[PDB]
Design a protein around this ligand. Sequence first.
Ligand SMILES: *[C@H]1O[C@H](CO)[C@@H](O[C@@H]2O[C@H](CO)[C@@H](O)[C@H](O)[C@H]2NC(C)=O)[C@H](O)[C@H]1NC(C)=O
Ligand SMILES: *[C@H]1O[C@H](CO)[C@@H](O[C@@H]2O[C@H](CO)[C@@H](O)[C@H](O)[C@H]2NC(C)=O)[C@H](O)[C@H]1NC(C)=O
Ligand SMILES: [Mg+2]
Ligand SMILES: [Mg+2]
Lengths: 481, 481
Amino acid sequence: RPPNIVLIFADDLGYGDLGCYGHPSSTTPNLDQLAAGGLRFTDFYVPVSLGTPSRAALLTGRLPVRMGMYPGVLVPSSRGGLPLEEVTVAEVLAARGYLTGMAGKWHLGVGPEGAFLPPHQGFHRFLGIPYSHDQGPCQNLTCFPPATPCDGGCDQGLVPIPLLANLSVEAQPPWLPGLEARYMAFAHDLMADAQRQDRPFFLYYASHHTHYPQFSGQSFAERSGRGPFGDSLMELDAAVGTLMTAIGDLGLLEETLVIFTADNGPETMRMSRGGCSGLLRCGKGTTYEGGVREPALAFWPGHIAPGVTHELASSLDLLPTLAALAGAPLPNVTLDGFDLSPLLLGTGKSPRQSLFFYPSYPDEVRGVFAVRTGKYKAHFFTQGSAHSDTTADPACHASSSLTAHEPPLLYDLSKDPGENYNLLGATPEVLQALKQLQLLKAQLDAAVTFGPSQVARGEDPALQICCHPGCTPRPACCHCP
Amino acid sequence: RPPNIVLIFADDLGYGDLGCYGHPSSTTPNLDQLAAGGLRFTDFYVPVSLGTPSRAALLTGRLPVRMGMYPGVLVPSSRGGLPLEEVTVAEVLAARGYLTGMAGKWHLGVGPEGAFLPPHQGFHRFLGIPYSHDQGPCQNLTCFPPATPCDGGCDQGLVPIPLLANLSVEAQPPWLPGLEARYMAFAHDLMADAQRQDRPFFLYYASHHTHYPQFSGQSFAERSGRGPFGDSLMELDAAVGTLMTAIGDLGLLEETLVIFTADNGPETMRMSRGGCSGLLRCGKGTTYEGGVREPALAFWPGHIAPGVTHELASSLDLLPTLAALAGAPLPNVTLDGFDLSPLLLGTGKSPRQSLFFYPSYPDEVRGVFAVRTGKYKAHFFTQGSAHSDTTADPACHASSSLTAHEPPLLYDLSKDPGENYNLLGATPEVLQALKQLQLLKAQLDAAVTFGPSQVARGEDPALQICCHPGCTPRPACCHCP
Ligand SMILES: *[C@H]1O[C@H](CO)[C@@H](O[C@@H]2O[C@H](CO)[C@@H](O)[C@H](O)[C@H]2NC(C)=O)[C@H](O)[C@H]1NC(C)=O
Ligand SMILES: *[C@H]1O[C@H](CO)[C@@H](O[C@@H]2O[C@H](CO)[C@@H](O)[C@H](O)[C@H]2NC(C)=O)[C@H](O)[C@H]1NC(C)=O
Ligand SMILES: [Mg+2]
Ligand SMILES: [Mg+2]
């Protein structure tokens, strides 16, 4: 009965990059066709616009500050990770008899002997990199075949990037141009095996596209009309087409729910090798709309009618929506998301009315930075980010320091999705929204306790993964292509 | 059964002016002796530190913004006044059979044909001035006998100040040096008449001391050791001694509850002819402690034991406390005060935990300026005032513009009653108080609707009281000494 679920999650992909979201030069045919036969969201969000906190909110349905996933992101030597008491979507579904698998980027911790890796958090199978593909030296890696080097060199002084098969190093570093093929092969096996055992599968595909540095296989190099950022987006798009064909071939089209979203806004610091937030303001690292609002598509033939919704939805609602769909019971913890099945099935409206946004570096004195309720969004604090540097808007830059706003900056997103015109710079409708927004912020700030910081547990270079354990000299000896 | 109640309310009198509150040169023997045989409050407050809003909160037990008593104060030509639907303490007690009377300053409105004057708000008898004694020309009035003129001239272009007997002009202007004697005579008659009819009395004595310009009868001129401000405080003090003697003479000491407080902090703009907030900061016109915290004494032999309380109390609690004491039922409206009888009778604690402070000029976008809960006080907005000009502290001056604080300025008043050291300039106790304070402000701001402004209804010079109605030329012809 339960449907097969495929969750595709891109990296550093903006609201404005898909062809079907208006980009003028992107090449995204498979995703455009998924949009045309399914539900496209205009108002779907993540609560925090950084890699780690966003992946944690997705898998647990819980605001990242509750389990210490702040500040910033995790690094290869981090001691901390997503606590093992947290229940993930993979576990909710595993206990209901799903065969669960994950391909790609984890970024939720490695820890002493890989205690925080995926196999310990409900995934039966796992093929991927445990953090971002730029958190290790890349001046000698090939990003585009036959021999175009990755640009800029990535993070120095670390072990090369490891490709893992569950808990074992399969390659270090992997060959970037062939990663996609590896991941499609893995996905195909997971599907077929689940079919054979008469059980539903759950595929978590956490792509490295479109994070820096850009790369692709040889079928896409110089073929998109948007340079390296495009080639890489085009490969991600072809991966979606490949998964849809594999779902075709096995006669599972009407029994599989396919969801596509992305973790956080574009890193405009990469300039034309980085994403695009379209009409929205600023990008990764900020609580402006270009940082937190992402593309989101839902496709399930004969169940989800083709259309466009403007209803409020969050990555936080994915656990409870998927549980409900699979007839799995919810964990016994406070959750911050809701079941969106009525909306998906067209029998009801989204139950979500409000959204809460935390910054990259949160603190308990300040609390939530921005809150949206209906079409209104208030900003109590504003701050630019180096990840959103280089565009013409000065509020996006790292030089825009942390600034308090009281009364808050107040925008009507139905008319000013670009956050250009502060309404408080009077009306009874506005005043009532203002008072609601202020009370929602004070209620959440008083009820939420911050879990102890995982990131502040520190770093220990002995925690880096090494293909040749015991090796010397570290870290350059750790390798095995 | 119900006790006789005498409520003495001074004008522009600071926390630091009574001898029993530490002043080094004031002469206040009767009040010091009342303090020595009764209850002295260290933490008693008014919600707004201006004449009109404070008198409204006292008589109704309701925050002044609910019935439009803002912004600023009322003037002789004001069209507005305290709405007649509001229920006052005088009415609560009149309906329980009290013989009620008021001597002194009203400042709650005059209106077309004196519709807002005291006789329409539950007082049986009324002898006094309908607004402050400086809201009319005083360059020719004698402030101190035999012929010392009032200093500075007061407000120009208006009708002289009227002394009224219910709704009729008894004199215009009155002779300042003999006002006290008039008021004591009136008080004595009210007491005796109530005794004779076997009924309890309620005397509301709203003194003009110690508002500018200072004045006194001849027994006090140049006799205090603190100049004109002192002479005037000394007369107010002798008035209290006279009322206590009159209560003695009629054998009513153990059957009468006597309360003394003041409406708002000192006007330091008058320099050494103005009051003193002692250790507290700033004065009239501000939401700093020297503006809102006043002297307060309760005396009732054989019922209230002599002592000092630090418990929280407000002018807002006087209606409900007096109702309860007289066995009178409370009006059917939302009240913002509580019954303090247990505290007064020494059988319980004050039920009040929090206090809310509004500025002279409030608005619905900003809401409450400052909130106190337990020993903590947060300031969300700060602002100086011309009424608090001339001292060495720059935050008190009119040049200190309206400033938002987020996070708020946070003080521990048990250790820093002077509001000098911001705690947020960390601890778990502090953080919990912070979150409580923020939530209390957002709850009150969301629940309180501002009543339509009475003061903004405008002015009409035809509303000025005239001893010779029809007169010309106005306003100088209006007079009758
Ligand atoms: C690591 O672990 C999984 C299982 O723990 C490995 O896979 C299994 O895959 C083969 C066929 O592909 C089956 O015969 C087994 O039954 C599978 N087990 C389960 C529980 O599914 C796999 O080689 C590794 N994960 C991947 C795909 O890298
Ligand atoms: C105006 O009104 C009151 C009454 O409305 C006047 O006073 C009364 O006072 C005399 C004795 O002083 C009594 O004989 C009457 O019974 C009183 N009436 C009440 C209801 O108390 C008074 O002259 C005026 N008020 C004052 C004192 O100025
Ligand atoms: Mg990312
Ligand atoms: Mg006053």
